[PDB]
C-alpha cells in the first residue's frame, strides 16, 4: 500500500523475508563475506519492522528498488571490490536499477563448495542451525546469482528437512548422502532449466515460446477453453520475458499476479488448484507450476471435423494463421498429456507445412485429406525410443544401462573426451531412473524435461571446444530437430582406433578401496578407452573382455598382496584382451 517494504514483510513473514533479503544481496555482492551480509539483513529487517509499526515512518514510502540500490551504494568497499558496479551509484532511479542488472558476475571465481563429512555437517546443524543454513544459502546464492531467489529458498527448506531427519538417525551417512545427491541433481537441473528457457526465448524467439506454452498449458488444463489458454499464454510470455530481463522484484510481482489470476479463475482452468490457491503468496506460483494435469473432458471428438473435414479449414487458417495453428496445438495437446511438447510442436509444424502447400490448391480438402497419417511415424519414433531404452533399463540396471549407453555413444562419437562421454552416459542413465519408473503416460514428458538439460549441458560443453561436426550439426538444429538428430547418429565409420596406452588399462588395489561411485567412474573411464582403442569389437567380444576384467577385479581384491596380482594377473588380462579383439 503506502510502504512496499512493510507490505512485503507482512506478506512474506519475518523468517522468509530475512532469507530472501540474504539471497538477493548475496547474488549482487558476491565477494562480500557472510558476516557483512548478516549485517545488511539485520539492518534491512529492523528498517522493515519500523515500517510495519508505522507505514509513514521516515523512508518507509521509498520503493524496494530504491532501498535495495541505496543499501548496495552504502557498501564501503564497493568501488575497490566491484569497480564498474560502484559507477551505477552515480545514476538516478530507474537507470541505477538497470545498471545493477548489467553488472552481476555470471562466473565469480570461487572455489567449488566441498561437501563436508556427515559428522561435521550434523554437528554444525545441531550447534547453530541458522548460521549453518544461512551460510550455505549465502555460499549457493553468491555462486548462482541468476537462480530465482524464492526457488533457492524452497531448496533450502528441503535441505533443512534432510538434516533435521537424518542427523538423528542410526546410519546418518546412509540417510543423508542420498538426499544431498538428489537435491544437488534437482538443483543443478533447475539452474540449467532456468538459464535455458531465457537463452531459448532469445535463440528461437517469442512465437516458438508461445507455441511451447500453448502445448504445455493445454496438457495441464485440458478443460480450459482455448481463449483462457491463449490469455494464460500471453501473460506467461510477459512473465518469462520480464523474468529473463533479470529484475527479481519485477519477476516476483509478475509471477504473483499470474498466480492470483489463476487462483481467482479456478473454475475456468483446473479442478486441481484448490490446495495451491490456499498457500501464501510465496509458495502459490511454485505450487501451481507443479500441479498435476487435470482430467480431460471424457467426451472429446476426433480433431478430423475442425482440422480436415470442415470446408472452412483454409478460410479459418488464412484469417489468423497462428491462432488457427494455436487451436490445433490446443486440441492436440489437451488430448495428449502423454506426448513431449516438442512432439506436439512437430505435429503442429507438419500441419502448418501441409495447410501452407494445400490451401494454395483448387481442392484443398484433397491435398490435406490424409495429413493425420503423417503424424503416425512422428509419434511412434519417440514412443519406440522410450520402449526400447526403458526395457533395456529393465534387463540391465542403472549401472549396466549406463555401460550399454557408454559403448553405444563412444562408438557413435568417439572423438568426444572420455570425461564428457562418462558424464553424459551416467546422466542419461539417471534420466532412465527418473522417467522409466513413471507410468507410460508420464514417460515421454519426463524424458523431454531431463533430456533438454542433459543435451544442453553436452552442447554448451561442445561449442566451447568442438570435436565432432555431427554433434555441432545436432546442437545447432531447430528445437524440434535436436533430439531426433542426436538419435539419428550412426556408428562413426571414418574414426581411427586410438593408439594402445598401457597406463590407461593399468589398475591397482586402491580400486577395491574407492566409494562405489569413484569405482564405477574408473571402470566406465576404462570402458570408454576400451571402445576407443577397439571400436570394431562386437557385443560378444566386449562382453567377453568386460566379464574377464569383472572376474579379474573380484579375484585380485580377495587375494593377499593384491597390488601384485593387479600388476601381474592384470598384464594377463591386457594381453588376452588385445588378441581377442
Ligand X SMILES: O=C(O)C(F)(F)C(F)(F)C(F)(F)C(F)(F)C(F)(F)C(F)(F)C(F)(F)F
Q: What angle do CA 329, 331, 332 make, to 5 degrees?
A: 60
Pick 396 or 467: Cβ nearer ligand MYR: 396
303 binds, among ligand X, ligand MYR, none (CB under 5 to 8 A by kind): none
**357 sits in which H/E element:** helix 341-358
How far is Cα 181 from Cα 551, in angstroms, rounded to an integer?
30
Residues at the contact surface with ligand X, assessed by CB under 6 A: 185, 188-189, 192, 204, 207-208, 211, 213, 216-217, 220, 236, 239, 255, 258-259, 262, 285, 288-289, 322, 325-326, 329, 345, 348-349, 352, 385, 389, 409, 412-413, 424, 427-428, 430-431, 434, 450-451, 453-455, 457-458, 471, 478-480, 483, 486-487, 489
For residue 215, state whether it binds ligand MYR (rule: CB under 6 A). Answer: no
545-561 residues labelled b (16+ CB within 10 A) or e (exposed): bbebbeebbeebeeeee
| Of the residues 9, 85, 122, 150, which one makes contact with ligand MYR according to CB under 6 A | 150
The C-alpha cell that represents 113 in the structure block: 563448495
C-alpha grid cell, residue 407: 559403448
- Nearer to ligand MYR by C-beta: 145 or 382? 382
User: Binding string, 357-376, against ligand MYR, x = CB under 6 A?
Assistant: --------------------
Q: Which residues are annotated as a binding site for Zn(2+)?
A: 65, 245, 247
Cα–Cα distances (Å) from 544 to 143, 539, 551, 578, in that order, read 46, 9, 10, 12
Residue 389 interacts with ligand MYR (CB under 6 A): yes or no: yes
| Span of 28-36, 252-260, 266-274, 305-313 interacting with ligand MYR by CB under 6 A | 252-260
Cα(51)–Cα(45) distance, rounded to whole angstroms?
Answer: 10
* CA pair distance 539, 232, nearest whole angstrom: 51
User: Could you tell which of ligand X, ligand MYR, none binds residue 156, using a CB distance below 5 to 8 A set by kind?
Assistant: ligand MYR
Selection from ligand MYR, ligand X, none that 122 binds (CB < 5 to 8 A by kind) is none
CB of 295 to ligand MYR, least distance (A): 23
- Among 458, 486, 237, 464, CA closest to 342: 486
User: Which partner in ligand X, ligand MYR, none is near 401 (CB below 5 to 8 A by kind)?
Assistant: none
431-439's contacts with Cβ under 8 Å and 24+ in sequence apart are 432/389, 432/390, 432/393, 432/398, 432/401, 433/393, 433/398, 435/390, 436/389, 436/390, 436/393, 436/394
Check residue 526 for interaction with ligand MYR (CB under 6 A): yes
Whichever of 65 and 412 has its CB closer to ligand X, that residue is 412
273: contact with ligand MYR by CB under 6 A: no
Minimum separation from the CB atom of position 318 to ligand MYR (A) = 30
Is-contact 396 424, C-beta < 8 A? no
Q: How many CB atoms lie within 10 A of CB 207?
A: 11
- Closer to ligand X by CB, 128 or 384: give it: 384
Give the residue from 347, 310, 340 showing the smallest Cα distance to 325.
347
By CB under 6 A, residue 385 contacts ligand MYR: yes
Which CB, 450 or 549, lies closer to ligand X?
A: 450
Q: What single-letter DSSP state applies at residue 365?
A: H
Work out whether the CA dihedral 381, 368, 354, 302 comes out positive or negative: negative
- Three-state SS for 193-214 is HHHHHHHHHHHHHHHHHHHHHH
- With CB under 5 to 8 Å by kind, the binding choice for 461 among ligand X, ligand MYR, none is none
User: Would residue 561 be called left, alpha or beta, if left means φ above 0 and alpha means ψ between -120 and 50 degrees?
Assistant: left
By CB under 6 A, name the binding residues for ligand MYR. 20-21, 24, 44, 64, 67-68, 113, 115, 121, 133, 136-137, 140, 149-150, 155-156, 159, 180, 184, 248-249, 252, 255-256, 259, 281-282, 285, 340, 342-343, 382, 385-386, 389-390, 403, 428, 431-432, 435, 444, 447-448, 451, 483, 505, 523, 526-527, 530, 545-546, 549-550, 573-574, 577-578
Amino acid at each position: 500500500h503506502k510502504s512496499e517494504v512493510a507490505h512485503r514483510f507482512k506478506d512474506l513473514g519475518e523468517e522468509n523475508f530475512k532469507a530472501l533479503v540474504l539471497i538477493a544481496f548475496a547474488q549482487y555482492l558476491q565477494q562480500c563475506p557472510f558476516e557483512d551480509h548478516v549485517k545488511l539483513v539485520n539492518e534491512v529487517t529492523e528498517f522493515a519492522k519500523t515500517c510495519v509499526a508505522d507505514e509513514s515512518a521516515e523512508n518507509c514510502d521509498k520503493s524496494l528498488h530504491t532501498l535495495f540500490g541505496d543499501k548496495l551504494c552504502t557498501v564501503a568497499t564497493l568501488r575497490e571490490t566491484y569497480g564498474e558496479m560502484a559507477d551505477c551509484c552515480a545514476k538516478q532511479e530507474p537507470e541505477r536499477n538497470e545498471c545493477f542488472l548489467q553488472h552481476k558476475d555470471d562466473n565469480p571465481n570461487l572455489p567449488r563448495l566441498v561437501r563436508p563429512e556427515v559428522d561435521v555437517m550434523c554437528t554444525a546443524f545441531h550447534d547453530n542451525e541458522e548460521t549453518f543454513l544461512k551460510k550455505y544459502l549465502y555460499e549457493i546464492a553468491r555462486r548462482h546469482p541468476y537462480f530465482y531467489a524464492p526457488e533457492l529458498l524452497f531448496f533450502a527448506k528441503r535441505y533443512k528437512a534432510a538434516f533435521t531427519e537424518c542427523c538423528q538417525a542410526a546410519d546418518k551417512a546412509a540417510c543423508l548422502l542420498p538426499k544431498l545427491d538428489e537435491l544437488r541433481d534437482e538443483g543443478k537441473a533447475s539452474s540449467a532449466k532456468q538459464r535455458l528457457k531465457c537463452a531459448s526465448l532469445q535463440k528461437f524467439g517469442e512465437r516458438a515460446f508461445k507455441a511451447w506454452a500453448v502445448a504445455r498449458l493445454s496438457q495441464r488444463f485440458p478443460k480450459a477453453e482455448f481463449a483462457e489458454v491463449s490469455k494464460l499464454v500471453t501473460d506467461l510470455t510477459k512473465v518469462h520475458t520480464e523474468c529473463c530481463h533479470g529484475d527479481l522484484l519485477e519477476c516476483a510481482d509478475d509471477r504473483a499476479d499470474l498466480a492470483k489470476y489463476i487462483c481467482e479463475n479456478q473454475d475456468s482452468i483446473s479442478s486441481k488448484l484448490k490446495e495451491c490457491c490456499e498457500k501464501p503468496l510465496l509458495e502459490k506460483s511454485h505450487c501451481i507450476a507443479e500441479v498435476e494435469n487435470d482430467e480431460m473432458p471424457a467426451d472429446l471428438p476426433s480433431l478430423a471435423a475442425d482440422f480436415v473435414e470442415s470446408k472452412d479449414v483454409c478460410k479459418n487458417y488464412a484469417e489468423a494463421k497462428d491462432v488457427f495453428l494455436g487451436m490445433f496445438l490446443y486440441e492436440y495437446a489437451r488430448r495428449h498429456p502423454d506426448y513431449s511438447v516438442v512432439l506436439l510442436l512437430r505435429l503442429a509444424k507438419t500441419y502448418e507445412t501441409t495447410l501452407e502447400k494445400c490451401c494454395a490448391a483448387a481442392d484443398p480438402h484433397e491435398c490435406y485429406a490424409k495429413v493425420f497419417d503423417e503424424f503416425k511415424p512422428l509419434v511412434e519414433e519417440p514412443q519406440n525410443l522410450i520402449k526400447q531404452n526403458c526395457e533395456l533399463f529393465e534387463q540391465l540396471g542403472e549401472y549396466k544401462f549406463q555401460n550399454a549407453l557408454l559403448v553405444r555413444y563412444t562408438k557413435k562419437v568417439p572423438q568426444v573426451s572420455t570425461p564428457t562421454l562418462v558424464e553424459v552416459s551416467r546422466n542419461l542413465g539417471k534420466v532412465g531412473s527418473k522417467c522409466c519408473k513413471h507410468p507410460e503416460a508420464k514417460r515421454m514428458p519426463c524424458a523431454e524435461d531431463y533430456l533438454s538439460v542433459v543435451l544442453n549441458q553436452l552442447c554448451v560443453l561442445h561449442e566451447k571446444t568442438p570435436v565432432s561436426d555431427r554433434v555441432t550439426k545436432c546442437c545447432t538444429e531447430s528445437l524440434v530437430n535436436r533430439r531426433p538428430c542426436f538419435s539419428a547418429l550412426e556408428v562413426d565409420e571414418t574414426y581411427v582406433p586410438k593408439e594402445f596406452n598401457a597406463e590407461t588399462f593399468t589398475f591397482h588395489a586402491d580400486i577395491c578401496t574407492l566409494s562405489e561411485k569413484e569405482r564405477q567412474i574408473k571402470k566406465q573411464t576404462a570402458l570408454v578407452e576400451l571402445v576407443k582403442h577397439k571400436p570394431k569389437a562386437t557385443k560378444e567380444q566386449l562382453k567377453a573382455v568386460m566379464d574377464d576384467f569383472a572376474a579379474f577385479v573380484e579375484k585380485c581384491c580377495k587375494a593377499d598382496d593384491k597390488e601384485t596380482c593387479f600388476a601381474e594377473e592384470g598384464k594377463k588380462l591386457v594381453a588376452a584382451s588385445q588378441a581377442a579383439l
